[PDB]
Design a binder for this molecule. Structure first.
Ligand SMILES: [Zn+2]
Ligand SMILES: [Zn+2]
Lengths: 45, 92, 56, 87, 56, 231
DNA sequence: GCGCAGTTGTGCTATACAACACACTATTATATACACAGCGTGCTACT
DNA sequence: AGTAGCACGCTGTGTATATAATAGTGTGTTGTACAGCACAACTGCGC
């Protein structure tokens, strides 16, 4: 499974496939994709 | 007296949302009413059934307005009345 | 072939003539235009040739 | 003015769509053959025009049976005020 | 403009603009100068659109 | 008759085609010798039925996906022998309820019965034959939130009701006597747990369940109050 | 019949009613359940 | 203490299965009868 976030309560979900799309603990159907864990690099230029 | 001026601004009326939606919603509601009447003729002349949900069709009005504001064509008899907002800058 | 009221014939003909007509030219003056199911007027061969951005 | 319904909005929609609630109001809810035939004939002299309904009401027999024998004695007129009645 | 009594033909009224751009313009001046500018944009669009169609 | 075109590298010939296609250059090239393979890549009954069906699903506000599943279904049945009747009212309701099922949406037999008068039992037979045809051409839970809507109940109430339905089905005992009674009773329990009044007659009316039925379900459900508690 | 002076016109503008034929649904039993709606009886409250 | 009203409980009929009987009755289908330029061409009117 893959980790997501709720729209409002910002709770961590990590719902799996074939769970459709909804938050547990509230009805918001807007799920954020929960930013990547691995490191990202920039040049200050 | 001089020839009347066509461009005198006091003689031009502007139409915002209200008058528009008035026009359009008028002709929608006429179409609705007329449809209910047709359903009554069909069921009474054919003596079948009357049930309010079948008699009233919501998407007539609903999808009608939704459509119009999507296309912005009032009819064409009018076009481009609706335009997606410019968020370029708060001034704009 | 059969069952000809001859009022139906004369109409069915006028139908054919109409289709072929708007096939070659959709915009003939005074006649009804052929409207594609979307409500847009059909683009006839003549429309394809006629204006700027036509083939020519 | 116009009044804005303030409810939880769920109840109003439930009534709108299929509600599992119906009706609750009503608007546009919409003698043997020997004596039978003899009696029917006396009606025919008594009435120059009559119906399979009037005959079935009298004879308490299906209109189909009434229509068969009547074809023999009576004839049908389908045009005029008396239309659909045997003379 | 509403700011002038009727039948006033003085050039201030009929649109002479006295002040140079460096000194700035009084409002009823400014408005006029906007009218002139608009004439200048309009005709320019017309001339351009027509002249090309001559060039063709 | 033949007419199928395949792309092959005459210089490679080693494999069948293994190539890449370049859309920007609009050309297609063998990935091996780097040769260009191609260039200049270019960029009456029914209609009446679907009309009235359209009206019905529309008045029902069902999302287009459901509408179109039912349309598809109905096309398959169509004129077939085995159907042998039903006057076009039964088929439209059947196909609808199918498209609801297949769409994972749920609608009660009563609800559709409110859009159309199908006489009931006749409807069941038609629905079963149609179901058989679909197999030949080869779940209450959803109802629980929908009902809350009708009552406008909080989210926690709804999820509580869901836990309640799963727990009740496992514990068996009356097997449910149709799902509808269980869904409504499950709610009635959950709400009575909480302070929010609907009382009883209001839910029996509103949701069209016999008051006696709700109370009867309530006694047995009350007995198992022990194991139904989520926290 | 001919000519002249209005009007038009035409491109472009970066089905209903009646009759006949064909299909059908009413009824009776049996376990099953499960359901829903009404009717009767009992209890409580008010006069 | 008596009467009326309300609530609860129990009994009856829909839902579903098969299966035969056989009507006439109802529904559907088919057949018959009745009811913005600027310049270009026609046409119309007058001589
Ligand atoms: Zn949430
Ligand atoms: Zn190659």
């Amino acid at each position: 499974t893959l980790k997501y976030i709720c729209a409002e309560c910002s709770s961590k979900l990590s719902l799996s496939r074939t769970d459709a799309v909804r938050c547990k603990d509230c009805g918001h159907r807007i799920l954020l994709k929960a930013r990547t864990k691995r490191l990202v690099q920039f040049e200050a230029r | 007296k001089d020839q009347d001026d066509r461009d005198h601004f006091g003689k031009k009326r502007l139409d915002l949302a209200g008058p528009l939606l008035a026009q359009l919603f008028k002709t929608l509601f006429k179409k609705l009413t007329k449809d209910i009447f047709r359903y009554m003729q069909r069921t009474v002349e054919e003596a079948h059934d009357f049930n309010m949900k079948l008699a009233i069709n919501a998407k007539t009005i609903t999808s009608g307005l939704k459509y119009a504001l999507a296309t912005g064509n009032w009819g064409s008899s009018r076009a481009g009345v609706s335009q997606v907002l410019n968020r370029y800058t708060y001034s704009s | 072939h059969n069952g000809a009221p001859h009022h139906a014939i004369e109409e069915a003909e006028s139908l054919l003539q109409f289709h072929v007509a708007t096939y070659m030219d959709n915009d003939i003056a005074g006649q009804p235009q052929a409207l594609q199911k979307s409500g847009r007027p059909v683009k006839s061969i003549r429309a394809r040739l006629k204006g700027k951005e036509g083939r020519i | 003015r116009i009044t804005t319904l303030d409810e939880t909005v769920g109840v109003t929609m439930s009534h709108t769509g299929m509600s599992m609630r119906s009706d609750n109001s009503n608007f546009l809810k919409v003698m043997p053959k020997k004596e039978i035939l003899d009696y029917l004939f006396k009606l025919f002299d008594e009435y120059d025009y009559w119906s399979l309904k009037g005959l079935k009401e009298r004879t308490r027999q299906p209109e189909a049976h009434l229509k068969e024998c009547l074809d023999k004695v009576a004839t049908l007129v389908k045009k005029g005020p008396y239309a659909f009645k045997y003379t | 403009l509403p700011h002038f009594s009727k039948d006033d033909y003085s050039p201030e009224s009929k649109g002479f603009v006295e002040n140079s751009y460096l000194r700035g313009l009084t409002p009823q001046e400014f408005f006029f100068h906007a009218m002139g500018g608009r004439e200048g944009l309009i005709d320019t669009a017309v001339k351009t659109a027509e002249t090309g169609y001559i060039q063709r | 008759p033949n007419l199928n075109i395949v792309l092959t590298c005459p210089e490679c010939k080693v494999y069948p085609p293994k190539i890449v296609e370049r859309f920007s250059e609009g050309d297609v090239v063998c990935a091996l010798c780097g040769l260009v393979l191609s260039d200049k890549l270019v960029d009456n009954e029914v209609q009446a039925a679907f009309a009235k069906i359209t009206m019905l699903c529309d008045a029902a506000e069902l999302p287009k996906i459901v509408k179109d599943c039912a349309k598809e279904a109905y096309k398959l049945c169509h004129d077939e022998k085995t159907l042998k009747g039903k006057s076009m009212e039964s088929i439209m309701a059947a196909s609808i309820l199918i498209g609801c099922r297949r769409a994972e949406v749920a609608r009660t037999f009563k609800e559709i019965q409110s859009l159309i008068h199908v006489k009931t039992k006749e409807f069941g037979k038609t629905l079963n034959i149609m179901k058989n045809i679909l197999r030949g051409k080869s779940q209450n839970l959803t109802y629980i939130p929908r009902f809350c809507s009708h009552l406008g109940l909080p989210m926690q109430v709804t999820t509580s009701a869901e836990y309640t339905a799963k727990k009740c089905k496992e514990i068996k005992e009356i097997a449910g006597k149709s799902p509808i009674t269980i869904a409504v009773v499950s709610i009635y329990l959950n709400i009575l747990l909480f302070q929010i009044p609907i009382t009883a007659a209001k839910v029996g009316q509103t949701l069209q369940v016999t008051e006696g039925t709700i109370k009867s379900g309530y006694k047995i459900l009350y007995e198992h109050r022990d194991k139904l508690v989520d926290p």
